[PDB]
Design brief:
part of a larger assembly, 2 chains, A: about 50 residues, mainly alpha, about 0% strand, rod-shaped, B: about 40 residues, Voltage-dependent calcium channel gamma-2 subunit (chain B), Glutamate receptor 4 (chain A), membrane protein, Gria4, Voltage-dependent calcium channel gamma-2
Chain lengths: ~50, ~40
C-alpha cells in the first residue's frame, strides 16, 4: 500500500504511577538542615566548649 | 551525588583527638600551678 505523510508522530514512552506524595521517615526531622550543617554543628559545639 | 571517604573523616577525627589533647594539656598546666599554690 501507499501511506500518506504522517498526520501525527509518536514514539515509545515510559508510563509510571504518579508519585502519591511520600511515606515519611524515622529521622526525617533533620531534613531542613543538610548533613554537613549537622556535622559542622557538632564540630563547632566541641570547639566553643 | 557524592560520598565522603576515609580521608575526610581522618581530618574530622583529627580535630576531635586534637581538641581532647587540648583540654588535657590545659588540665596539666593548671595542675602544675596548683602544686605551686599549695607548697608556698
Amino acid at each position: 500500500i501507499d501511506f500518506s505523510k504522517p498526520f501525527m508522530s509518536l514514539g515509545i514512552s515510559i508510563m509510571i504511577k504518579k508519585p502519591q506524595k511520600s511515606k515519611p521517615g524515622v529521622f526525617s526531622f533533620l531534613d531542613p538542615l543538610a548533613y554537613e550543617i549537622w556535622m559542622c554543628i557538632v564540630f563547632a559545639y566541641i570547639g566553643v566548649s | 551525588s557524592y560520598s565522603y571517604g576515609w580521608s575526610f573523616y581522618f581530618g574530622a577525627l583529627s580535630f576531635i583527638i586534637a581538641e581532647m589533647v587540648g583540654v588535657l594539656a590545659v588540665h596539666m598546666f593548671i595542675d602544675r600551678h596548683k602544686q605551686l599554690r599549695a607548697t608556698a
